[PDB]
Amino acid sequence: LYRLFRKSNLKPFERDISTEIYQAGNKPCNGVAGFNCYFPLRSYSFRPTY
Amino acid sequence: GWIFGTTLDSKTQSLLIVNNATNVVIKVCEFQFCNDPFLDNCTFEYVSFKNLREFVFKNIDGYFKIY
Ligand SMILES: *[C@@H]1O[C@H](CO)[C@@H](O)[C@H](O)[C@H]1NC(C)=O
Ligand SMILES: *[C@@H]1O[C@H](CO)[C@@H](O)[C@H](O)[C@H]1NC(C)=O
Ligand SMILES: *[C@@H]1O[C@H](CO)[C@@H](O)[C@H](O)[C@H]1NC(C)=O
Incomplete structure (x- = not known):
């Protein structure tokens, strides 16, 4: 699984582990998916025929 | 002892x-x-x-150094 949303750029060799649903801006989410409320955890679905 | 971190409430990593x-x-x-x-x-x-007893704690490049 891979990331696409985060609120900051990480320092080198840093290990903040957080898999919560992230805001896309200043709109609050409170753990509810929707507009401006996106999951960062995506997948590539690795097949040998790609 | 000492305890480090950012939030320290069993949410993220804490030394x-x-x-x-x-x-x-x-x-x-x-x-x-x-x-x-x-x-x-x-x-x-x-x-x-x-x-x-004198101690110095610093954190550079993901490294925690204790003097
Ligand atoms: C470290 O944690 C603080 C929490 O107070 C946060 O504001 C800061 O952005 C974090 N540093 C990172 C993620 O590099
Ligand atoms: C101190 O902590 C270590 C690590 O768990 C343990 O092996 C040891 O028995 C402890 N000693 C005492 C006196 O509690
Ligand atoms: C300890 O590890 C388990 C396995 O990933 C995790 O579910 C749990 O939240 C961890 N405990 C923490 C972060 O306090």
Whole structure:
């Protein structure tokens, strides 16, 4: 699984582990998916025929 | 001992150094400890008015240095 949303750029060799649903801006989410409320955890679905 | 981190409420990573008079316990587990913080997930773990002890703790490049 891979990331696409985060609120900051990480320092080198840093290990903040957080898999919560992230805001896309200043709109609050409170753990509810929707507009401006996106999951960062995506997948590539690795097949040998790609 | 000393306890480090950002939030320290069993949410994200939190350092812990405890001297229990025999060893020096160093853990990075996020889990809670004794409810009153006194002496009677673990990706890194390390076990080893007359007195003045001086320490310097710094954190550079993901490295925690103790003098
Ligand atoms: C470290 O944690 C603090 C929490 O107070 C946060 O504001 C800061 O952005 C974090 N640094 C990172 C993610 O590099
Ligand atoms: C101190 O902590 C170490 C690490 O868990 C343990 O092996 C040792 O028995 C402890 N000593 C005392 C006196 O509690
Ligand atoms: C300890 O590890 C488990 C397994 O990933 C995790 O579900 C749990 O939240 C961790 N405990 C923390 C972060 O306090």
